[PDB]
């Protein structure tokens, strides 16, 4: 069916920071986005998909039993033990509701992937929190508990075939270190991340995010890092990266399902990202991805902290999924962006004939 799915559940707002109510990963991130969908009359055009809890067996598709156990144990912790547990990780806060919210974010995306793969919808958007792409097999990180996108790729394979070709495009301004590591030896899941890097000065502060990390073993060539250096980037740079790298590689890979780790923290106005991608920019990125996998695209909220920016940007993506005409948007690239793109082209030409 030529239908767009949408999943949102206000229960995911319950995850909160009890020590700093102004922490940027706010409950109202998802309610503001949902409201904007209603205001723009997008919500009524979508098929509503229910949220559900991920099961612990589903979480074990990507995470260790110990990590699942540790996060589950936070459900009945007193505040000082929540503080202690959170502090074991890089950039994590935890409340008694966090585990359930993380389960809902994952289960929402499983139901969305299922709706796509059973033909109930063509494509879908998932307005979920907390985010997922920094979460590793064995640890939480960067506001993320479980790796929602990675889990969704494995869940998709679990109801089709182990080798189902899944493309994950991660346009959150941060590197999805967890997603890269979970799939680093896998050729069934192509991971492509665009991210601010600044030679390691930008979170998560690891050389794992550099362009020369191309995958391991049979996964060699199936990890594509597009790192930005030298300050502000925007629509011109992202469009060029899609033109020269993301789309030619994706077409050669021929995915059967596309997942977008769709953070909107590279957006104009975001205080954590410092970049300038416009809502129209995100619309064009979405419209390009819709040409892949017979349109089977699932857009999953990751980061993004300017409430107005993320609401306008993710709504524009949903508008594209619904088949609306792309808005009007060539400006020369920042010189360092040309350097980045050419570095990635050089790194991946051995693996992808489309780059030669
Ligand atoms: C962890 C993270 C992004 C995650 C993300 O979006 N991953 O995809 C960003 C850190 C480095 C950051 O910049 C920050 C800034 C302000 C702040 N407070 C004002 C509390 C807390 C953290
Ligand atoms: Cl418990
Ligand atoms: K990214
Ligand atoms: K991979
Ligand atoms: N509407
Ligand atoms: N539930
Ligand atoms: N306590
Ligand atoms: N890796
Ligand atoms: N393709
Ligand atoms: N280039
Ligand atoms: Zn981010």
Distance 183 CA to ligand 2 centre (A): 30
Please work out whether the CB of residue 338 comes within 6 Å of at least one atom of ligand 10. Answer: yes
User: Is residue 9 marked as binding?
Assistant: no
- Domains belonging to the chain, first-starting first, are 1-356 (3.40.800.20)
As to burial, measured by CB atoms within 10 angstroms (0-12 exposed, 13-18 middle, 19+ buried), residue 46 is buried
**Whose alpha carbon is nearest atom 1 of ligand 5?**
41
Question: What dihedral angle (degrees, nearest 10) is formed by the CA atoms of 17, 313, 191, 232?
Answer: -90
Q: Which residues line ligand 7 (CB under 6 A)?
A: 78, 80
CA-CA distance, 263 to 171, in Å (whole number)? 6
* Structural resolution in Å: 1.6
CA angle 169, 225, 138 (to 5 degrees): 80
- To the question of whether residue 15 is assigned a binding role by annotation, the answer is no
* Whole-angstrom distance, CA of residue 212 vs CA of residue 215: 9
Ligand 5 is surrounded, with C-beta below 6 A, by: 41, 44
CB-based contacts of 179, cutoff 8 Å, min separation 6: 133, 147, 149, 150, 168, 170, 191, 193, 261
Residues with CB under 6 A from ligand 8: 180-181, 184, 208, 213
Tell me if 244 CB under 6 Å of ligand 10.
yes
Sheet holding 47-48, edge to edge: 47-48, 4-8, 123-127, 297-301, 257-262, 166-170, 189-196, 223-228
How far, in Å, is the centroid of ligand 7 from the Cα of 80?
5
**From its phi and psi, is residue 129 left (phi > 0), alpha (psi between -120 and 50) or beta?**
beta
| Contact assessment for residue 271 and residue 24, using Cβ atoms and an 8 Å cutoff | yes
Q: For residue 129, how far is its CA from the centre of ligand 11 (angstroms)?
A: 12
20 is in an annotated binding site: no
């Amino acid at each position: 069916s030529p239908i767009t799915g949408l999943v949102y559940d206000q229960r995911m707002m319950l995850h909160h920071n009890m020590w700093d109510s102004h922490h940027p990963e706010l409950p109202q991130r998802i309610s503001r986005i949902f409201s904007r969908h209603e205001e723009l009359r997008l919500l009524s055009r979508c098929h509503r998909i229910p949220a559900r809890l991920a099961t612990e067996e589903e979480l074990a598709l990507c995470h260790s039993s110990k990590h699942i156990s540790i996060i589950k144990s936070s459900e009945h912790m007193k505040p000082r033990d929540l503080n202690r547990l959170g502090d074991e990780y890089n950039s994590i806060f935890i409340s008694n509701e966090s585990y359930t919210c993380a389960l809902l974010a994952a289960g929402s995306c499983f139901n969305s992937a299922q709706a796509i793969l059973t033909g109930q919808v063509r494509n879908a958007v998932a307005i979920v929190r907390p985010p997922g792409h920094h979460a590793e097999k064995d640890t939480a990180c960067g506001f993320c508990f479980f790796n929602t996108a990675a889990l969704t790729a494995r869940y998709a394979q679990s109801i089709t075939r182990e080798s189902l070709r899944v493309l994950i495009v991660d346009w959150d301004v941060h590197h999805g270190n967890g997603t890269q590591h979970i799939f680093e030896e896998d050729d069934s899941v192509l991971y492509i991340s665009l991210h601010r890097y600044e030679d390691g000065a930008f979170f998560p502060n690891s050389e794992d995010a550099n362009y020369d990390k191309v995958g391991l073993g049979k996964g060699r060539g199936y990890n594509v890092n597009i790192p930005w250096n030298g300050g502000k980037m925007g629509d011109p740079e992202y469009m060029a990266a899609f033109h020269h790298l993301v789309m030619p590689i994706a077409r050669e890979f021929a995915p059967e399902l596309v997942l977008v780790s769709a953070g909107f923290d590279a957006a104009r106005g975001d205080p954590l990202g410092g970049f300038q991608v416009t809502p129209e920019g995100y619309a064009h990125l979405t419209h390009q991805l819709m040409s892949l996998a017979a349109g089977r695209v699932l857009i999953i909220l990751e980061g993004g902290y300017n409430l107005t920016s993320i609401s306008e940007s993710m709504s524009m993506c949903t508008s594209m999924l619904l088949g609306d005409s792309p808005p009007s948007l060539l400006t020369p690239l920042k010189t360092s962006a040309t350097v980045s793109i050419n570095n990635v082209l050089r790194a991946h030409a051995p693996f992808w004939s489309s780059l030669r």
